[PDB]
Design an enzyme around this catalytic site. Structure first.
Site, PDB file in Angstrom:
ATOM      1  N   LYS A  57     -12.917 108.113  59.928  1.00  0.00           N
ATOM      2  CA  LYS A  57     -12.470 106.684  59.243  1.00  0.00           C
ATOM      3  C   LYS A  57     -12.860 105.340  60.541  1.00  0.00           C
ATOM      4  O   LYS A  57     -12.615 104.235  59.198  1.00  0.00           O
ATOM      5  CB  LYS A  57     -11.076 106.801  59.402  1.00  0.00           C
ATOM      6  CG  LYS A  57     -11.016 107.779  58.659  1.00  0.00           C
ATOM      7  CD  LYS A  57     -11.543 108.160  57.244  1.00  0.00           C
ATOM      8  CE  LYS A  57     -11.810 109.699  56.723  1.00  0.00           C
ATOM      9  NZ  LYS A  57     -12.424 109.547  55.571  1.00  0.00           N
ATOM     10  N   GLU A 111      -2.296 117.248  47.682  1.00  0.00           N
ATOM     11  CA  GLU A 111      -1.897 117.918  47.172  1.00  0.00           C
ATOM     12  C   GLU A 111      -1.127 119.022  48.609  1.00  0.00           C
ATOM     13  O   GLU A 111       0.041 119.777  48.897  1.00  0.00           O
ATOM     14  CB  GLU A 111      -2.634 118.985  45.814  1.00  0.00           C
ATOM     15  CG  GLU A 111      -2.552 118.097  44.709  1.00  0.00           C
ATOM     16  CD  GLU A 111      -1.639 119.337  43.807  1.00  0.00           C
ATOM     17  OE1 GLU A 111      -0.352 118.575  43.392  1.00  0.00           O
ATOM     18  OE2 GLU A 111      -1.849 119.708  42.962  1.00  0.00           O
ATOM     19  N   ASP A 151     -16.922 108.581  53.153  1.00  0.00           N
ATOM     20  CA  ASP A 151     -15.836 109.403  53.802  1.00  0.00           C
ATOM     21  C   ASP A 151     -16.115 110.367  54.836  1.00  0.00           C
ATOM     22  O   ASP A 151     -16.279 111.623  55.183  1.00  0.00           O
ATOM     23  CB  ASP A 151     -16.096 110.597  52.134  1.00  0.00           C
ATOM     24  CG  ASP A 151     -15.874 111.066  51.877  1.00  0.00           C
ATOM     25  OD1 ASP A 151     -14.220 111.562  52.446  1.00  0.00           O
ATOM     26  OD2 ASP A 151     -15.518 112.319  50.821  1.00  0.00           O
ATOM     27  N   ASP A 203     -12.713 106.756  50.079  1.00  0.00           N
ATOM     28  CA  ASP A 203     -12.116 107.566  50.495  1.00  0.00           C
ATOM     29  C   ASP A 203     -10.594 107.225  51.601  1.00  0.00           C
ATOM     30  O   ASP A 203     -11.492 106.777  53.003  1.00  0.00           O
ATOM     31  CB  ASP A 203     -13.023 108.953  50.237  1.00  0.00           C
ATOM     32  CG  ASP A 203     -11.629 109.859  49.891  1.00  0.00           C
ATOM     33  OD1 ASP A 203     -10.654 109.472  49.670  1.00  0.00           O
ATOM     34  OD2 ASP A 203     -12.034 111.082  50.253  1.00  0.00           O
ATOM     35  N   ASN A 204      -9.429 107.485  51.332  1.00  0.00           N
ATOM     36  CA  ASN A 204      -9.140 108.190  52.748  1.00  0.00           C
ATOM     37  C   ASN A 204      -8.602 106.620  52.884  1.00  0.00           C
ATOM     38  O   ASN A 204      -8.217 106.145  54.708  1.00  0.00           O
ATOM     39  CB  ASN A 204      -9.881 109.031  53.922  1.00  0.00           C
ATOM     40  CG  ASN A 204     -10.460 110.193  53.181  1.00  0.00           C
ATOM     41  OD1 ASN A 204     -11.632 110.090  53.300  1.00  0.00           O
ATOM     42  ND2 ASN A 204      -9.132 110.881  52.490  1.00  0.00           N
TER      43      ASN A 204
HETATM   44  N1  LIG Z   1     -21.225 108.655  61.267  1.00  0.00           N
HETATM   45  C1  LIG Z   1     -21.219 109.203  61.120  1.00  0.00           C
HETATM   46  N2  LIG Z   1     -22.511 109.374  59.990  1.00  0.00           N
HETATM   47  C2  LIG Z   1     -23.019 110.503  59.629  1.00  0.00           C
HETATM   48  N3  LIG Z   1     -22.137 111.132  59.147  1.00  0.00           N
HETATM   49  C3  LIG Z   1     -21.503 111.520  60.424  1.00  0.00           C
HETATM   50  C4  LIG Z   1     -21.090 110.308  60.287  1.00  0.00           C
HETATM   51  N4  LIG Z   1     -19.012 110.111  60.669  1.00  0.00           N
HETATM   52  C5  LIG Z   1     -19.066 112.091  60.568  1.00  0.00           C
HETATM   53  N5  LIG Z   1     -19.992 112.269  59.454  1.00  0.00           N
HETATM   54  C6  LIG Z   1     -20.121 113.473  58.979  1.00  0.00           C
HETATM   55  O1  LIG Z   1     -18.525 112.848  57.970  1.00  0.00           O
HETATM   56  C7  LIG Z   1     -18.764 113.938  57.539  1.00  0.00           C
HETATM   57  C8  LIG Z   1     -17.185 113.965  56.563  1.00  0.00           C
HETATM   58  S1  LIG Z   1     -16.105 114.975  55.819  1.00  0.00           S
HETATM   59  C9  LIG Z   1     -17.594 114.145  54.391  1.00  0.00           C
HETATM   60  C10 LIG Z   1     -17.066 114.671  52.617  1.00  0.00           C
HETATM   61  C11 LIG Z   1     -17.316 114.645  51.586  1.00  0.00           C
HETATM   62  N6  LIG Z   1     -17.731 113.778  51.588  1.00  0.00           N
HETATM   63  C12 LIG Z   1     -17.335 116.193  50.053  1.00  0.00           C
HETATM   64  O2  LIG Z   1     -16.380 115.006  49.841  1.00  0.00           O
HETATM   65  O3  LIG Z   1     -17.664 116.983  50.158  1.00  0.00           O
HETATM   66  C13 LIG Z   1     -18.568 115.516  57.997  1.00  0.00           C
HETATM   67  O4  LIG Z   1     -19.656 116.038  57.772  1.00  0.00           O
HETATM   68  C14 LIG Z   1     -19.027 114.607  59.678  1.00  0.00           C
HETATM   69  O5  LIG Z   1     -19.491 115.498  60.170  1.00  0.00           O
HETATM   70  O1  LIG Z   2     -10.198 113.361  52.374  1.00  0.00           O
HETATM   71  C1  LIG Z   2     -10.207 113.991  53.560  1.00  0.00           C
HETATM   72  C2  LIG Z   2      -8.751 113.930  53.830  1.00  0.00           C
HETATM   73  C3  LIG Z   2      -8.452 114.097  55.407  1.00  0.00           C
HETATM   74 BR1  LIG Z   2      -6.708 114.746  56.233  1.00  0.00          BR
HETATM   75  C4  LIG Z   2      -9.042 113.985  56.435  1.00  0.00           C
HETATM   76  C5  LIG Z   2     -10.829 113.508  55.640  1.00  0.00           C
HETATM   77  C6  LIG Z   2     -11.819 113.391  57.460  1.00  0.00           C
HETATM   78  C7  LIG Z   2     -12.719 113.474  57.120  1.00  0.00           C
HETATM   79 CL1  LIG Z   2     -14.180 112.673  58.204  1.00  0.00          CL
HETATM   80  C8  LIG Z   2     -13.063 112.640  54.972  1.00  0.00           C
HETATM   81  N1  LIG Z   2     -12.525 113.067  54.575  1.00  0.00           N
HETATM   82  C9  LIG Z   2     -11.374 113.485  54.561  1.00  0.00           C
HETATM   83 MG   LIG Z   3     -11.912 112.276  52.035  1.00  0.00          MG
END
Ligand SMILES: Nc1ncnc2c1ncn2[C@@H]1O[C@H](CSCC[C@H](N)C(=O)O)[C@@H](O)[C@H]1O
Ligand SMILES: Oc1cc(Br)cc2cc(Cl)cnc12
Ligand SMILES: [Mg+2]
Ligand code: NA
Length: 213
Positions: free
Chosen positions: A142, A197, A139, A167-168
């Site tokens: 991407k 949503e 997550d 995810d995503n």
């Molecule tokens: N290569 C990487 N290694 C570790 N963290 C990363 C990364 N690339 C992005 N991130 C971190 O990944 C997060 C993506 S949003 C993650 C959402 C969380 N899993 C939830 O649902 O609550 C961000 O905080 C970003 O700083």
């Molecule tokens: O759930 C998500 C929705 C959208 Br839009 C963007 C995202 C980006 C990250 Cl890095 C992780 N989760 C995401």
């Molecule tokens: Mg996500």
């Protein structure tokens, strides 16, 4: 002051210390009523719950912690003795996540690793004495899903049965990742549709179960 700090503050002001449910509910309330944030959220949370319950992983790896919503979601269903490792590149996010885990009372089940996934993944074996993973939640950014998955493969951290949950995979989308796992006999995939949503658009999770090399 940042959105993420505002989220954390809303929680400390409204949730009940030591109560993961109430923490989740507060984050969902805030991010639904005040300002959207990229937490996996409650709908996708239901799917994540079912997965954890079905497979009962003893060792989970999360890529991307952010505010800790997903770390709290999973850690609260872990069996006694099971553990969650979460990797977060941004030290501001690791701090918010740490405090969210502290507030929920889950800090003993979860370990935050500070760094980029690709830097930390090859260190898992010798520095953190991991043998193999039971489950991985992807997550983070991407563009990282595919190379990190291949990297997990190459470091020998996957075993027959390991559950990858991505995810995503539709929005923002991970076409190369999906093509690889759906294409490969080394993974058995299921798609779980879900609706975002706030952005009013269909997304989804992919469950990829490793079969071995
Ligand atoms: N290569 C990487 N290694 C570790 N963290 C990363 C990364 N690339 C992005 N991130 C971190 O990944 C997060 C993506 S949003 C993650 C959402 C969380 N899993 C939830 O649902 O609550 C961000 O905080 C970003 O700083
Ligand atoms: O759930 C998500 C929705 C959208 Br839009 C963007 C995202 C980006 C990250 Cl890095 C992780 N989760 C995401
Ligand atoms: Mg996500
Ligand atoms: Na496949």
């Amino acid at each position: 002051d940042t959105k993420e700090q505002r989220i954390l503050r809303y929680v400390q002001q409204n949730a009940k210390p030591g109560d993961p449910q109430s923490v989740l509910e507060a984050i969902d309330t805030y991010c639904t009523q005040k300002e959207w944030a990229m937490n996996v959220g409650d709908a996708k949370g239901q799917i994540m719950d079912a997965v954890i319950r079905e497979y009962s992983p003893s060792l989970v790896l999360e890529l991307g912690a952010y505010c800790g919503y997903s770390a709290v979601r999973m850690a609260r269903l872990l069996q006694p003795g099971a553990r969650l490792l979460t990797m977060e590149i941004n030290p501001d996010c690791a701090a918010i996540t740490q405090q969210m885990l502290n507030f929920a009372g889950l800090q003993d089940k979860v370990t935050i690793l500070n760094g980029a996934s690709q830097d930390l993944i090859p260190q898992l074996k010798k520095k953190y004495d991991v043998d193999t993973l039971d489950m991985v939640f992807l997550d983070h950014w991407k563009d990282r899903y595919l190379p990190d998955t291949l990297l997990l493969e190459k470091c020998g951290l996957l075993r027959k049965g390991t559950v990858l949950l991505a995810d995503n995979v539709i929005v923002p989308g991970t076409p190369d990742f999906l093509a690889y796992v759906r294409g490969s006999s080394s993974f058995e995939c299921t798609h779980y549709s879900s609706y975002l949503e706030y952005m009013k658009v269909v997304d989804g999770l992919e469950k990829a179960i490793y079969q071995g090399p």
